[PDB]
Symmetry: D2
Subunit: 480 residues, 4 copies
Amino acid sequence: HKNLTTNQGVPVGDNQNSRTAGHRGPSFLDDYHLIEKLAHFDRERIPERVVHARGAGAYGVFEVENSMEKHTRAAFLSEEGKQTDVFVRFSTVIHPKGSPETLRDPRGFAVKFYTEEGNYDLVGNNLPIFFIRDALKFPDMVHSLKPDPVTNIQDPDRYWDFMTLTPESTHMLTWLFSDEGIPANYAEMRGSGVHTFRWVNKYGETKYVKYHWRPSEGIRNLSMEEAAEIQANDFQHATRDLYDRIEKGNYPAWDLYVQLMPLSDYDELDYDPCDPTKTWSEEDYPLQKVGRMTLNRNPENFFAETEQAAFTPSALVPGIEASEDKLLQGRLFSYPDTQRHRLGANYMRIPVNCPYAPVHNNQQDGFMTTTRPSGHINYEPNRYDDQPKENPHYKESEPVLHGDRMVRQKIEKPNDFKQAGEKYRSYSEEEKQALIKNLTADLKGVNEKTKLLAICNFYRADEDYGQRLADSLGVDIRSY
Amino acid sequence: HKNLTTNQGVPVGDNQNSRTAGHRGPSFLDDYHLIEKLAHFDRERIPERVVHARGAGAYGVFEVENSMEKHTRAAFLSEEGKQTDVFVRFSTVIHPKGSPETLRDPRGFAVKFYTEEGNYDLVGNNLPIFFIRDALKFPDMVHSLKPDPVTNIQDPDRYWDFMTLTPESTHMLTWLFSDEGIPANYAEMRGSGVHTFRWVNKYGETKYVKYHWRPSEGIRNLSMEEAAEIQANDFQHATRDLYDRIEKGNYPAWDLYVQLMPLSDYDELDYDPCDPTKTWSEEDYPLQKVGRMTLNRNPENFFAETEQAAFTPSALVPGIEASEDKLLQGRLFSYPDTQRHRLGANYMRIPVNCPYAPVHNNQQDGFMTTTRPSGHINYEPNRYDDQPKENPHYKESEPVLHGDRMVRQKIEKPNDFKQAGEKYRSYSEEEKQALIKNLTADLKGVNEKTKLLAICNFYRADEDYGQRLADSLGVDIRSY
Amino acid sequence: HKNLTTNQGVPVGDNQNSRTAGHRGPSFLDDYHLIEKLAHFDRERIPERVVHARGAGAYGVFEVENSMEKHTRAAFLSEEGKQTDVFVRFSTVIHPKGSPETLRDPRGFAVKFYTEEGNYDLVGNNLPIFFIRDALKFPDMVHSLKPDPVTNIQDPDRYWDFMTLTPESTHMLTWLFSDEGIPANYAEMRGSGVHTFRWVNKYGETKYVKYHWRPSEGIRNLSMEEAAEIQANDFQHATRDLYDRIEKGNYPAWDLYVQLMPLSDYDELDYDPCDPTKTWSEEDYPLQKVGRMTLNRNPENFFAETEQAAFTPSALVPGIEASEDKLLQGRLFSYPDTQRHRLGANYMRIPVNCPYAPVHNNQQDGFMTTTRPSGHINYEPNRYDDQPKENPHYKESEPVLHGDRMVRQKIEKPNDFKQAGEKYRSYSEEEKQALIKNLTADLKGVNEKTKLLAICNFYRADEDYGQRLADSLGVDIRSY
Amino acid sequence: HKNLTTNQGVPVGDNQNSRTAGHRGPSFLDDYHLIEKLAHFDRERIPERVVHARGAGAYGVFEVENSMEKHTRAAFLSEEGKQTDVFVRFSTVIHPKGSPETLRDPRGFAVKFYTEEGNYDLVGNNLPIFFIRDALKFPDMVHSLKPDPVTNIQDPDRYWDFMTLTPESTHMLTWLFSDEGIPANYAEMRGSGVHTFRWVNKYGETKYVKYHWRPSEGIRNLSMEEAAEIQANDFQHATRDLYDRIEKGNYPAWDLYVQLMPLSDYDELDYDPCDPTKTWSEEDYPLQKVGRMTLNRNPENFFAETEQAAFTPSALVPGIEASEDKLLQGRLFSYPDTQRHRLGANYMRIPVNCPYAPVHNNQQDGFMTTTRPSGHINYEPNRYDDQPKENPHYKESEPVLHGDRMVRQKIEKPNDFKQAGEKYRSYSEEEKQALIKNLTADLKGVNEKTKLLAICNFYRADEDYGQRLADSLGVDIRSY
Ligand code: HEM
Ligand code: HEM
Ligand SMILES: Oc1ccccc1Cl
Ligand SMILES: Oc1ccccc1Cl
Ligand SMILES: Oc1ccccc1Cl
Ligand SMILES: Oc1ccccc1Cl
Ligand SMILES: [Cl-]
Ligand SMILES: [Cl-]
Ligand SMILES: [Cl-]
Ligand SMILES: [Cl-]
Ligand SMILES: [Cl-]
Ligand SMILES: [Cl-]
Ligand code: NA
Ligand code: NA
């Protein structure tokens, strides 16, 4: 048995009635419990994520099967059997908190690994590529996809205008308009690092790496009609499903695979291996098994732990570094930047975001300082041997630059259509039909000129792809 | 033709490519356009409304048919034919911003009247009563209705626990679990002030008043199964419907009626006329027509205008005052309190929130001071005749207090069950069946003890009501 | 020996050099340590207190000498020898952080008592009265005293315009323009609760109380010329003095006295005993010793503990209640209100502000939730006997109301000049000379009309007071 | 004559009394004027600048005498006689907002030019060099100089520990401990761009440039004893002096000079021309006159205009670009980053910060959106010819990179002592004496080892310099 108290720790005599002039009269200003309780209620909400606002989280463990020390000095990957705690958030992308989990969208697949050498965030999506290859375009892309800023309703004519004029998007769209555009839930779902990263071993040798997560539950998708049926009955079925699996002891898991590529392979490929609109052939760069992630614990509080969770691709650990991927480069900045605003300058002190590894540095103050700081020395260099010092054992690599000059210039070999064609051809006939059907429902009402440009882009990917789409949209393209 | 610029007004040479070390190398910190554009994108979002987060807005005009100067000095109501601009936001209640408009919930009905004597906000709902009668209980109620703080899913067992132990809620539930719990859209919908207010005429005479909005489009509701059918295909159908009506010139409208009651009738009744769990008889206190509100203009920008709109029941104008209703009394505080956090200390300067009437006072500064302030004098009293002075012509009334002590104590004659029974008996058989059906779906999974207490509460309202609900739930209540 | 780390817990390899294109080239965006470190530095600052921004804090102990249970049920006062931890902040008032401690001003004297029944804040000043008696005037008074909003320099012509037109200020000014307007430091300084409060014993009997703190070090003040001498060489001498005393083991202390007055004495006094422009006679209502407060510990971190400290007069504990004082009534609201903005919605979780008594309630969420919340139940009433419940043993008293109407109307018996005269006459000749000298230096440049009105006010207090001031200003007052 | 109103535009009937239970009773919650007025008062303050918190601003005009088109395409410099409006803020550095203007510090000298091709900020200081040459060290430096985080008092032992271990500081200190460490006021003061920048002409030819501002009022400085004497009587004398000059029509002015250096001179020098611890010889790179700035208008509102002013070295205009200076590079990021936090995401809409040039881009929303946005298109590329487009005429240069790797590594030729010695020798004997005197007063209490290292650093600058300092400190350095 416990007292209800104010935040001052004074027990509350009456949590039912305001303080009034007699039993029915107007309310008095001297009602500290009322004001305090209303004032806090009034401040419960914080800004949602600018994208991936709808989501769900869970904790678990990652266990190494095959040490990766040949290729990366990353501590968490150093030994067979090595276990690292994780927190994972899954999400949709475009619509706000509260929006349905039955909509078409990439799904987020964000994993925080609590390593001995710091927190490592792998901030992935289910699909292995992206729409654009430079961060400067991200707000444009997002704005085009988001609900129209007048009507508050998402409009195909807006995002198809942007996508058609951004033909590097063609490969991504060829995945997103398969039925994998609507995963059945978060468990029966693929995961992908998307970007090429750099793995650096104990000799300082670098390889390019890509990450893949393979669901123990298998991949399952929803047709447009299956999605609608679920939407009727539950706008939050994926969030429900994840919680319930875990609660009943049916823990979902994913195996982690990598592909590895020598840096030297750049110059021989017909695409840039750091263009995130591209995948790497699994024939030429086979999947290699690393280990397994099992999710086995729901959070105690959704707001404190899932809503306040902060991931960043720039949360890298020794042995794992960014590539030159220009999309990735922008992300390094944008996540902690947005998080400082969404969560506060001290967001890294929120329990879910805290490292297991020790934190010692000379930063200070900021809104909501709760950590009991002490000491006179908040500057380096200083004369005190016991104060925190740099540690050159932990320097990052020094990647070679091939450019002469600071430039704003697209990558060479953009090759916007080829892989999109390859992917189309890899689809079964059923999958090809679903693709075309899903594309047609999206494009049928879009401006004619934009519609034609979309057809042309998919025609450049593959002539059958393009023609089938044109037939299904009733567009005669013979004259071109 | 225009340049794309930075916020510094410098034309942008390249809005496609980040600045890099050659065409494929990593990105440079000296890229002001990239950082500025990503930084602003990163800060687009502000906190959603703590309740009523999902909603839609429109502008229109209110026109007086019958002048009300006999009963209120309110300027906007003073003359036949007098037109006043309005902004209106409609909303659901519980779920966040992106949530479906097909869920059961009261609907918000908030009207901002831009009057010559200031802005008047009539912050209503469709349904004419409320679940509780004291503001101290509002965070409890909301917390019980909101998604469970662990699962992120709304749970009938949680809100039913609260509602059953809060039997003043019995009348509201009797309305909410009719099919009016899911209005077909925002146009075909009732509006209510809910609270009793005080109207004060030029002689200082006071009457109690209640407000009612009657849709020109008629009231139409959705069954559970009709709601699901819509939800399958559109999670923002009401928002769509409102915009589209207005866009095609099919302007929705509502006629404003009041009921007026002498303060001296308090003793003539078996309920407190300022208990917002109660309605007033339309036989005894007939509806009197005031005028008509027509919505005829969509906003230019949803975020700037609808999302940032701020209403408060405390935005009262001379002649229109609060009653002693304890629920209302807390609302007077909570809305501007939450708005200062949600929108900033200067939220009253956001264009939609600005009065048409002049503003002059001695307030200053605050985040985002955009108004070009000037002058040396920011204090009153002062020696300068041309500086703003109080105007005793605009004093409010001095309501009589019947209590002689500061107390926390429930009102006399709570009478929690009677009007609920009256409302039940007023329903057609079809409506009664829908009520029972809707209640049974909601209650069938809740804790047995809580389930029985619900039945007992609705039994106290009306024995048939109760028994029918018990039968439908399979609960044998013979032993009691 | 410790590593310098990022906030992710990764050891920093180089805390000296940014990451660049060769040894002298421009900087790269992929420098997480640089961006994280700069970004936190960039966010160190929070808003300063709107008033009392300059100040210093310390911890200590309060020990009861005479138990007060006859007059108050306050737990911390219940018996002889009982010790309670305190935190105390002293301050100036008007000028910002950084401003000199040698300026004229009241000094703040804020004491936070960490009691077993919750935190009790006695938010005092050195001087025992105030300039105004209604909180509605506080922004005006402050705005008049603060630096001119055009020039950023405090202007006597401004605050004298306000004070002269606000003659209830006459008593306060008669204290503030003695040399006690500049205490020598924070240790050799009076403390005052200022307001009358209500003390309520276990039988529910109420008395009016006033609080007084008497320095073990004695009261010492600075002349204008002694202040100027110190100001030349140290703009933080009081903050220095406090810290150094405590560091040397020379702990400053204050004895707590109260005066106690029956509520029934209201009606026979010639002033309102809850007018905070009034003191009570120490002959008629003698000082009664309660105990002693010793300050013996400097904070570990000035920002975290002294800058983020939050006191409110509404932080009351059972047995100690507000009076009807209209100045106090506004303060009950304004402190937690300003704190929510200055510090965050969760400021009560900042360690210095935390109670020693348990906190359990149903509030949730808010920016920077760091407390690891858990559980499904965040609403009351609920069906769970182990969840926090109200406890009616802790109800507050039910003060009698003498008014029958909601009014805006000055108190009866304002008696603006009498006690000012009494205070003037109580001064030694030396003190009277200092008063006149200090007033003359402040008034000599102000508008002639305002200057006359000031003279007139102090003349109404005492004719010698007024004439001496007029002579010293060279103002001929014969025609009046 | 005007009414006092609420922010709702309702006239205020009584700005003197709170609303109470009779003329002497407690206060009612239903007092919207009181709560609104207090609540805004409670939110007046925003965070101060993390450095240069104390300062003063003024508007004026810059007029070109010699067009610079041969060296830079900058529009504002293109024609003889061309006038551009400016806003200028001057400041100290270390202590907070209310702190004295008599302290030792660099002074800030920040100029915002409202040009036809965007706002150009030249964010200078009076002194022409800086303590450090890499932004990664800035928070360390600042933390060492700032008041101790325990005591809130600045401590020479702290900043001397940092400076001695950071010997690149030796030149800066040799300026700052002359009497120019305390300018007499803001008018009789030097100004400096400090950094080398890049000027780019219409042919794309680049030169290195340095800026210098020469006061029409001449340079005047204060001895330690003259500073103390002013401090006694006025803690804001520079702010006062600026305002009063301008109010009287005695407008202060500065002539703008540049030095220009070919990029190819890098190899011709014994220091890095982009090392901001270095000046360029005026013999070898003579001062060339550009024009004159006159300050002639005080702001209307100190908070709205001077306090909310935002300057950034990254507010560059076509023809004026950053250099590779690593100190400057960090600044490009840190100003807008801090400003977003200090002022809000939309701080560029605060009137003083607004460009005169048109602003058109696809950014949207953010706290306090007051600009009336409209339109459906917030993304580029788009199909609409009339929407804002990039303009390749406004591309920046493509500086050549000499490094082939991403590195963290000090510049070559740091040459930490030489120019410090040159500057010492350039001092008159009087100035040398003042230098030594000022240094000795600062060093005499610091840790002996730190003290010795300081002496050694200044000895390496110049043996006389070092020996004189050692003698004056009573440190025997025979034996080194
Ligand atoms: C330039 C490209 C991109 C930018 C600028 C960007 C930006 C952002 C931002 C600002 C957030 C909000 C972060 C927060 O509030 O914590 C976010 C969330 C997220 N983004 Fe991205 N994003 C980009 C590309 C991608 C890519 C390629 C992926 C996957 C490969 C991705 C996956 C995610 C995920 C999963 C989240 C949610 C993290 C969470 O659940 O808390 N984004 N993004
Ligand atoms: C103690 C009882 C209540 C409290 C404390 C309360 C509190 C609040 C708060 C804090 C908000 C969000 C405001 C904002 O973010 O701007 C809100 C929104 C709202 N409430 Fe209530 N409320 C209560 C009862 C009611 C009642 C009785 C009605 C109708 C009679 C109602 C109708 C609304 C509406 C319509 C909105 C949304 C306004 C809009 O569209 O922007 N509420 N309430
Ligand atoms: O990116 C998306 C998401 C949903 C629908 C269509 C597209 Cl292109
Ligand atoms: O208040 C609500 C809202 C939706 C469903 C049920 C209840 Cl009680
Ligand atoms: O205890 C109960 C329960 C349900 C209906 C009637 C009664 Cl009396
Ligand atoms: O090593 C030192 C120290 C101080 C002065 C001169 C020298 Cl060479
Ligand atoms: Cl650090
Ligand atoms: Cl706030
Ligand atoms: Cl005001
Ligand atoms: Cl609570
Ligand atoms: Cl921010
Ligand atoms: Cl843009
Ligand atoms: Na009429
Ligand atoms: Na006793």
